[PDB]
């Protein structure tokens, strides 16, 4: 039984522009098995109105999902992605950097 | 350019928690157009792109009837594979399946695929010639022998060479504005400095479709795959994709370096 | 368009 | 109908080519079979075909055309054991849907017809029967307008008969005003038909 | 070796319940039930994959119910049988799509078990005119007065079943066509050389196997119970 730890990318659909609404994305990929936990966080509190794409997989059979939420970036607000997976000793948190 | 249709199926046993999870998803190239999820309210096959909604009741009843059959058959497969590998009922186990067809620029059959994985590893696959099977282990031979005896490959080949090609063609014509588009990448660059000695620059490719792209770095022409950072191409959420590449080299001298984007929508290889 | 036949493993 | 076969009982002489065809309604079908069913028995598979083109197997040729949704079967050098109902079968999902079937009759080549009508009497001695035999394969027998006299059709022959073969039909009634001279007078019979006195 | 079915024949009073059984080929995960009537193809009834019933013909009545409890054998049951249920009930199994059929159960539904009669069998000996005219001798056998319409006719010559020269009708005919209760008739021929018939040492027996009532069935009348049985008639050669 192979296990594969997820790759994780936090990022915005459009160039981040303070004030203007956008979408915050969390792309988790390359993982196996498929039970995964993904939350989008605003100042460390999870956003409820998140949705995700349908589970699929790549040539190598590892899974990928996209979680996303409508959000209006600000300068003080911090956004994060929290992922948990059987291959993680602890939940992995990846903060949103608007230049990545 | 080339096109493809693929279906992706995931079946996950839930030991001691009842029926297994079944997810089915269908793509034309990089655009998902249908989904079925055993966990969702509808228990139908559902549209996921605008151009499939015009299909009528017979198509949806039929795709629903078939997706439930794939489901039933994968439910039996999970029990069979547990038996083949003498695994206990305590563990969760995953069967994955992909099949579909590519066509070329002429929209004629280019290749077919039909392959299974169990617990992440290859189990059995239709060979390129569509007439023989690669079986990964001694348990997968049991399936190979069942399928050779029952001439499964010939039936599969008819689906992949005829029906599949046929319906891909129909989709590509109904999703003409969506599917046959090309979005050139919106390029740009960013400059930062981690220190005085070494500064970082980032090549940016945004809003492009199809997802295929290549970002390479040149120091008067060579390839700098040392100190390189390429992220996997990623979906923007609106049907387009993103990607960026960045390398760190001595500050002040960064025009000996240049970033070359190559994508189908860009007529000549844009350099920056 | 799904394949109308299924094959047991 | 989901599966349509050529209509009417087919009659083909011993040694000729019999030919059956079939169309199916759903273009997504992938599995195609020809089944044979003897009169009192169950469907038995004779061949399958899954790709476009021709499949040869002994005296049997199947053809499949997916673009036109057409299945055929050719039997060359027809034996009497080829007399059966031929069933075209096509998959709808993971089950087989059958057509209504085409009956095939292989006719013996009667090389010296001598149509006669013989009177047979019982060995115990109710009725008695008229036997119309030795006619060629292009005579057919029709039933009485008598509701009180019965007529079998062109006697089907056992498929393992040998040396020399022939066709027959019987008729019978119970009442004294009934003879063989006028038994088959509602069927059309050769002018040379022997009526012994 | 093969798909098996029981019973092979079954007569049922209209209104009663009947149950057929089907033992498929043990490795076949897929099992099917069909119905067939004379002059038509097998009509699809239901489909099992292991123990789960996956499909049912949209026209099938709730009087029909099929089960395959442990994914092996299967039973099909009809409740409150009516006359339109009479048909051949076919079982079939498959590893994938190719179907392998059992020998069927042939069901007859009639208003009263007192409509079931065995055949009377008569042999008619060759005409002398045919003898002198062709030097061949045709015997005729007539099974008459029976219901339902399935009988099997064989010819036995000096203790041995013969096929050469034998010509049996494919289907029986109805003696009273303007009646639903109609009893049937069936004919057959055995043709030999004139010399073989003229030998009085030669014994000819027409044998008709009738399928009738089971042993369980309740017989209500004075006449003999019309059970599954064989009825024969015979003749000996005549030198004349």
Short mmCIF file of C-alpha atoms in Angstrom, two decimals, chain E:
data_model
loop_
_atom_site.label_atom_id
_atom_site.label_comp_id
_atom_site.label_asym_id
_atom_site.label_seq_id
_atom_site.Cartn_x
_atom_site.Cartn_y
_atom_site.Cartn_z
CA UNK E 1 -21.66 -29.45 -16.60
CA UNK E 2 -23.94 -26.69 -17.90
CA UNK E 3 -26.79 -24.63 -16.53
CA UNK E 4 -29.49 -26.80 -14.93
CA UNK E 5 -33.19 -26.09 -14.42
CA UNK E 6 -36.06 -27.87 -12.70
CA UNK E 7 -38.81 -28.71 -13.16
CA UNK E 8 -38.48 -29.33 -16.94
CA UNK E 9 -42.27 -29.25 -17.36
CA UNK E 10 -44.97 -27.93 -15.03
CA UNK E 11 -48.77 -27.73 -15.26
CA UNK E 12 -50.50 -25.30 -12.91
CA UNK E 13 -54.17 -24.48 -12.28
CA UNK E 14 -54.91 -20.83 -13.07
CA UNK E 15 -54.73 -18.97 -9.77
CA UNK E 16 -52.07 -21.17 -8.17
CA UNK E 17 -48.41 -20.32 -7.52
CA UNK E 18 -45.41 -21.93 -9.21
CA UNK E 19 -41.68 -21.84 -8.52
CA UNK E 20 -38.85 -22.68 -10.93
CA UNK E 21 -35.28 -23.29 -9.85
CA UNK E 22 -32.05 -22.64 -11.72
CA UNK E 23 -28.58 -23.90 -10.87
CA UNK E 24 -26.03 -21.89 -12.89
CA UNK E 25 -22.39 -22.54 -13.70
CA UNK E 26 -20.65 -21.94 -10.41
CA UNK E 27 -18.04 -19.44 -11.65
CA UNK E 28 -20.61 -17.24 -13.46
CA UNK E 29 -21.27 -14.05 -11.47
CA UNK E 30 -24.10 -12.94 -13.80
CA UNK E 31 -27.47 -14.73 -13.96
CA UNK E 32 -30.49 -13.93 -16.14
CA UNK E 33 -34.11 -14.99 -16.48
CA UNK E 34 -35.93 -14.96 -19.82
CA UNK E 35 -39.43 -15.81 -21.02
CA UNK E 36 -40.03 -17.32 -24.48
CA UNK E 37 -43.24 -17.98 -26.42
CA UNK E 38 -43.57 -19.92 -29.70
CA UNK E 39 -42.49 -17.89 -32.72
CA UNK E 40 -40.63 -15.27 -30.69
CA UNK E 41 -37.28 -14.57 -29.10
CA UNK E 42 -36.43 -14.88 -25.42
CA UNK E 43 -37.81 -11.83 -23.60
CA UNK E 44 -35.60 -10.41 -20.86
CA UNK E 45 -37.09 -10.75 -17.34
CA UNK E 46 -34.44 -9.93 -14.71
CA UNK E 47 -30.70 -9.82 -14.14
CA UNK E 48 -28.56 -10.69 -11.09
CA UNK E 49 -24.92 -9.84 -10.44
CA UNK E 50 -23.83 -12.09 -7.50
CA UNK E 51 -26.79 -11.94 -5.08
CA UNK E 52 -27.94 -8.43 -6.12
CA UNK E 53 -30.83 -8.04 -8.57
CA UNK E 54 -29.59 -5.23 -10.84
CA UNK E 55 -32.35 -4.92 -13.53
CA UNK E 56 -35.99 -5.91 -14.07
CA UNK E 57 -37.99 -5.72 -17.32
CA UNK E 58 -40.17 -2.63 -17.03
CA UNK E 59 -43.28 -4.65 -17.99
CA UNK E 60 -42.80 -7.47 -15.45
CA UNK E 61 -45.65 -7.86 -12.96
CA UNK E 62 -45.33 -7.88 -9.18
CA UNK E 63 -46.68 -11.43 -9.40
CA UNK E 64 -43.20 -12.33 -10.72
CA UNK E 65 -40.38 -12.22 -8.19
CA UNK E 66 -36.91 -13.68 -8.50
CA UNK E 67 -34.25 -14.31 -5.88
CA UNK E 68 -30.60 -15.52 -5.74
CA UNK E 69 -29.96 -15.46 -1.97
CA UNK E 70 -26.31 -16.55 -1.81
CA UNK E 71 -25.28 -15.62 -5.36
CA UNK E 72 -25.47 -19.24 -6.51
CA UNK E 73 -28.75 -20.93 -7.45
CA UNK E 74 -31.79 -18.82 -8.33
CA UNK E 75 -35.55 -19.21 -8.07
CA UNK E 76 -38.29 -17.46 -9.99
CA UNK E 77 -41.82 -17.37 -8.64
CA UNK E 78 -45.19 -16.55 -10.19
CA UNK E 79 -48.16 -15.74 -7.96
CA UNK E 80 -51.81 -16.01 -9.02
CA UNK E 81 -50.86 -17.48 -12.40
CA UNK E 82 -53.08 -16.55 -15.34
CA UNK E 83 -53.22 -18.13 -18.79
CA UNK E 84 -50.86 -15.58 -20.39
CA UNK E 85 -48.02 -16.84 -18.17
CA UNK E 86 -47.74 -20.12 -20.13
CA UNK E 87 -44.33 -20.01 -21.80
CA UNK E 88 -40.81 -21.41 -21.71
CA UNK E 89 -38.92 -19.96 -18.71
CA UNK E 90 -35.19 -19.86 -19.48
CA UNK E 91 -32.27 -19.46 -17.09
CA UNK E 92 -28.88 -18.28 -18.28
CA UNK E 93 -25.55 -17.46 -16.67
CA UNK E 94 -22.40 -15.70 -17.88
CA UNK E 95 -18.89 -14.77 -16.70
CA UNK E 96 -19.21 -11.42 -18.58
CA UNK E 97 -21.63 -11.15 -21.53
CA UNK E 98 -21.78 -14.49 -23.47
CA UNK E 99 -24.84 -16.34 -22.24
CA UNK E 100 -25.19 -20.06 -21.49
CA UNK E 101 -28.76 -21.33 -21.16
CA UNK E 102 -30.35 -24.04 -19.05
CA UNK E 103 -32.78 -26.48 -20.64
CA UNK E 104 -35.78 -24.39 -19.55
CA UNK E 105 -39.00 -24.94 -17.62
CA UNK E 106 -42.10 -25.24 -19.82
CA UNK E 107 -45.14 -23.95 -17.90
CA UNK E 108 -48.78 -24.56 -18.77
CA UNK E 109 -51.52 -22.64 -16.98
CA UNK E 110 -55.03 -24.02 -17.45
CA UNK E 111 -58.35 -23.23 -15.78
CA UNK E 112 -58.81 -26.76 -14.37
CA UNK E 113 -56.46 -29.72 -13.99
CA UNK E 114 -59.36 -31.74 -15.45
CA UNK E 115 -58.45 -30.34 -18.90
CA UNK E 116 -55.22 -32.41 -18.86
CA UNK E 117 -55.52 -35.62 -20.97
CA UNK E 118 -52.84 -38.12 -22.09
CA UNK E 119 -52.58 -39.19 -25.74
CA UNK E 120 -54.24 -42.11 -27.39
CA UNK E 121 -51.74 -43.60 -29.85
CA UNK E 122 -52.63 -45.49 -33.05
CA UNK E 123 -50.37 -47.02 -35.71
CA UNK E 124 -51.61 -47.28 -39.30
CA UNK E 125 -49.97 -49.86 -41.54
CA UNK E 126 -48.62 -49.26 -45.06
CA UNK E 127 -51.00 -49.21 -48.01
CA UNK E 128 -50.70 -52.17 -50.35
CA UNK E 129 -51.00 -49.80 -53.33
CA UNK E 130 -47.92 -47.90 -52.10
CA UNK E 131 -46.05 -51.20 -51.77
CA UNK E 132 -46.52 -52.33 -55.36
CA UNK E 133 -46.05 -48.78 -56.69
CA UNK E 134 -42.78 -47.77 -54.99
CA UNK E 135 -41.41 -50.87 -53.15
CA UNK E 136 -41.33 -48.84 -49.90
CA UNK E 137 -43.65 -49.04 -46.87
CA UNK E 138 -44.72 -46.00 -44.81
CA UNK E 139 -46.17 -46.47 -41.32
CA UNK E 140 -48.07 -43.57 -39.75
CA UNK E 141 -48.44 -42.84 -36.03
CA UNK E 142 -51.24 -40.63 -34.65
CA UNK E 143 -51.14 -39.31 -31.09
CA UNK E 144 -54.56 -37.77 -30.45
CA UNK E 145 -56.62 -36.21 -27.69
CA UNK E 146 -53.92 -34.81 -25.44
CA UNK E 147 -53.39 -31.62 -23.39
CA UNK E 148 -51.07 -29.73 -22.89
CA UNK E 149 -49.34 -29.87 -26.25
CA UNK E 150 -45.86 -31.20 -25.41
CA UNK E 151 -45.19 -34.86 -26.29
CA UNK E 152 -42.04 -36.61 -27.59
CA UNK E 153 -42.45 -39.23 -30.30
CA UNK E 154 -39.88 -41.93 -31.06
CA UNK E 155 -39.95 -45.05 -33.27
CA UNK E 156 -38.59 -48.39 -32.01
CA UNK E 157 -37.99 -51.30 -34.42
CA UNK E 158 -37.24 -54.71 -32.87
CA UNK E 159 -36.29 -53.11 -29.56
CA UNK E 160 -34.08 -50.35 -31.03
CA UNK E 161 -34.81 -46.64 -31.51
CA UNK E 162 -34.53 -45.69 -35.19
CA UNK E 163 -34.12 -42.36 -36.96
CA UNK E 164 -33.58 -43.36 -40.60
CA UNK E 165 -36.86 -42.89 -42.44
CA UNK E 166 -38.55 -41.13 -39.49
CA UNK E 167 -40.53 -37.94 -40.18
CA UNK E 168 -42.36 -36.24 -37.28
CA UNK E 169 -44.51 -33.09 -37.36
CA UNK E 170 -42.65 -30.16 -35.75
CA UNK E 171 -45.66 -28.84 -33.81
CA UNK E 172 -48.98 -30.44 -32.87
CA UNK E 173 -52.27 -29.24 -34.35
CA UNK E 174 -55.47 -28.37 -32.49
CA UNK E 175 -58.51 -30.64 -32.78
CA UNK E 176 -61.09 -27.96 -31.82
CA UNK E 177 -59.55 -24.62 -32.84
CA UNK E 178 -62.65 -22.66 -31.73
CA UNK E 179 -62.13 -23.46 -28.05
CA UNK E 180 -59.57 -22.44 -25.44
CA UNK E 181 -59.52 -25.96 -23.91
CA UNK E 182 -58.57 -27.59 -27.23
CA UNK E 183 -56.90 -30.97 -27.19
CA UNK E 184 -54.12 -31.67 -29.69
CA UNK E 185 -52.98 -34.24 -32.26
CA UNK E 186 -49.55 -35.25 -33.57
CA UNK E 187 -48.42 -37.35 -36.55
CA UNK E 188 -45.24 -39.18 -37.54
CA UNK E 189 -44.02 -41.49 -40.32
CA UNK E 190 -41.63 -44.41 -40.50
CA UNK E 191 -40.76 -45.58 -44.01
CA UNK E 192 -38.90 -48.83 -44.69
CA UNK E 193 -38.31 -51.09 -47.66
CA UNK E 194 -41.25 -53.20 -48.77
CA UNK E 195 -39.16 -56.30 -48.10
CA UNK E 196 -38.41 -55.24 -44.50
CA UNK E 197 -42.09 -54.60 -43.77
CA UNK E 198 -43.15 -57.87 -45.45
CA UNK E 199 -41.11 -59.79 -42.81
CA UNK E 200 -43.56 -60.77 -40.02
CA UNK E 201 -40.57 -61.16 -37.70
CA UNK E 202 -40.33 -57.36 -37.58
CA UNK E 203 -41.92 -55.37 -34.75
CA UNK E 204 -42.64 -51.64 -35.04
CA UNK E 205 -43.51 -49.51 -31.98
CA UNK E 206 -44.48 -45.84 -31.91
CA UNK E 207 -43.65 -44.39 -28.48
CA UNK E 208 -45.09 -41.09 -27.22
CA UNK E 209 -43.79 -39.49 -24.01
CA UNK E 210 -46.45 -37.26 -22.42
CA UNK E 211 -45.77 -34.58 -19.79
CA UNK E 212 -48.67 -34.25 -17.39
CA UNK E 213 -49.45 -33.91 -13.69
CA UNK E 214 -46.94 -34.35 -10.90
CA UNK E 215 -47.38 -36.85 -8.09
CA UNK E 216 -48.35 -34.02 -5.70
CA UNK E 217 -51.30 -32.97 -7.85
CA UNK E 218 -54.81 -33.53 -6.50
CA UNK E 219 -56.89 -35.76 -8.74
CA UNK E 220 -60.62 -35.17 -8.58
CA UNK E 221 -62.34 -37.39 -11.21
CA UNK E 222 -63.15 -41.03 -11.96
CA UNK E 223 -60.79 -41.37 -14.92
CA UNK E 224 -57.13 -42.15 -14.35
CA UNK E 225 -54.85 -39.34 -13.17
CA UNK E 226 -53.20 -37.84 -16.33
CA UNK E 227 -49.60 -38.01 -15.12
CA UNK E 228 -46.33 -37.87 -17.01
CA UNK E 229 -46.31 -41.21 -18.84
CA UNK E 230 -45.41 -42.98 -22.08
CA UNK E 231 -48.04 -44.41 -24.44
CA UNK E 232 -47.13 -46.85 -27.23
CA UNK E 233 -48.82 -48.46 -30.20
CA UNK E 234 -47.40 -51.19 -32.39
CA UNK E 235 -47.63 -53.26 -35.55
CA UNK E 236 -45.92 -56.35 -36.90
CA UNK E 237 -44.84 -56.88 -40.48
CA UNK E 238 -47.27 -58.68 -42.77
CA UNK E 239 -46.07 -60.96 -45.55
CA UNK E 240 -49.54 -60.70 -47.11
#
